[PDB]
Assembly symmetry: none
Homo-oligomer: 77 residues x 6
Amino acid sequence: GGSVQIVYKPVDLSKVTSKCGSLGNIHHKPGGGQVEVKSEKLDFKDRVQSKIGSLDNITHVPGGGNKKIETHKLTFR
Amino acid sequence: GGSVQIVYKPVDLSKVTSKCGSLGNIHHKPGGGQVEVKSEKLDFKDRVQSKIGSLDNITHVPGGGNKKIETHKLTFR
Amino acid sequence: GGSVQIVYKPVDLSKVTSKCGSLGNIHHKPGGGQVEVKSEKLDFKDRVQSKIGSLDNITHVPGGGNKKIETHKLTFR
Amino acid sequence: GSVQIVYKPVDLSKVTSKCGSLGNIHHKPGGGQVEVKSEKLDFKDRVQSKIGSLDNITHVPGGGNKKIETHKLTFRE
Amino acid sequence: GSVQIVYKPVDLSKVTSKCGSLGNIHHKPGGGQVEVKSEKLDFKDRVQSKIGSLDNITHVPGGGNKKIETHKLTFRE
Amino acid sequence: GSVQIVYKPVDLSKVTSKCGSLGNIHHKPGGGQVEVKSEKLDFKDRVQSKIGSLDNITHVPGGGNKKIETHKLTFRE
């Protein structure tokens, strides 16, 4: 009956780098319109998730904003 | 019966870096519009999640904002 | 019986860094519009979560704001 | 057999940055008369205003120097 | 059978930054008359106002110097 | 046999920053007459105001010097 040896030794030397001299002079003026929701005589038999709004806004201005993602998975038997 | 040896020795010397010389002069003026929700005679027979807004806003100006996300999983039998 | 040896010894000398020389002159003026919610004759038979508002606002201006999120899991039999 | 190693590099290097306003002559410069007359103005948003006759603005984010100098001597590897 | 290693690197190098306003002559510089006359103005938001006549402005985020020097002597590893 | 190691690196290098306003001559500078006249102004938000005839502004976030100097001598590990 044979034995099993597993050696899991991945090596990461990586760089994820940014340089920006200046970041700026950003003028952002998003406007949501009018929203009218009229509902009558609705029947729901299971879970309801509802969102209503005129503007969802994300304004992200990172000096880096670099991302690294790693997943290491070893499954035996 | 055969033996099992698992050696899990991943190595991480990685770098995630930024330089920003200056970050600024950001003018942000998000405007939500009017929201009207009219509901009559509605029947809900399970869980309800409801959000009503005019403006949802996130403004995020990090001098870095860099991310490293790393997951290690070993499953045996 | 057959022996089992697991050696979980992952190594991490990684860096997440930023340099911002200056961070500022941010002018933020979010405005929520009018919200009108009108409801009549509604029947609910399980848990209700309800949020109503004009403006939800997050303003986040960290000098760093870097993240390192790391997870280790060893599951046996 | 005998071994002599003489490791005598000489570094006389000059690394010089000269950035912005250097060695200028400004002989009797003159701003003119500046005259801002304003009546019945409505401003509904941010006002950024600069009024002046003569300005000498020098802005230097640059002019940085970087010197890297690595010496290695290996005997019998 | 003999070994001599003489490790005598010499560094006389110069690293210099001259950033901003240096060695200038300003001879009799004149701001003119500055006159701001204002009647019946409405401002509903932030006012930033600068009223000068002669301005000398030097801003230097730059001009940084970095020197890295490394010396290694390895004999028989 | 015999081994001689003479480790005698010499560093007489210079690292200098000259950031901002240096060695300038300002002979008889003149701000003009500054005259700000205002009637019936209405402000509903933040007012930032600077009024002056002659200004000399020097701002130096920069001009930082960094020196790193590493020596290693390894004999038979």
